Design a protein around this ligand. Sequence first.
Ligand code: HEM
Length: 154
Amino acid sequence: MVLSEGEWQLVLHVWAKVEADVAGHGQDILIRLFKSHPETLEKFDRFKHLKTEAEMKASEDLKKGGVTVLTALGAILKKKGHHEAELKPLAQSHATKHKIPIKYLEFISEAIIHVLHSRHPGNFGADAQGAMNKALELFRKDIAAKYKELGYQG
Ligand code: HEM
């Protein structure tokens, strides 16, 4: 699949706003994932013991977690499809270390879109959301291809 430069533009334009506060978007996102899909939390040995959102909110390890995710993702989008290199190490830990099924990747893509829709209504109309979805789906499709090569699901 291939995004046009116009789609990249839309993506990168909302991303510039997320980057005004990485930590906070980082929190909203993981908390969204964990509330919608409680099972994903079990994957996180360092977070499984958090019972409530309030606790999620106060956890400094979660906030750090979110910045890492967003910074890794950001570094991938800014590549505009040329992200082979960046993806390798990321697919290897997720498939062989963490053991994250593609399905959980879908869940987070969902939470990312949800949060950008609440926080940047003016920068995240129908077109911009269509463009981020396409960018996230390209992300997943490639990570899925790498998984397969590393000997996981596929
Ligand atoms: C946008 C998609 C994702 C990005 C860019 C991302 C990125 C990262 C990065 C950069 C790290 C640190 C180094 C590493 O192990 O590779 C990490 C760790 C981790 N990720 Fe992800 N991740 C994503 C999705 C997921 C999902 C959806 C889950 C679980 C449902 C998850 C589970 C984990 C786990 C369990 C660790 C280890 C945490 C720790 O103990 O330090 N990842 N991820």
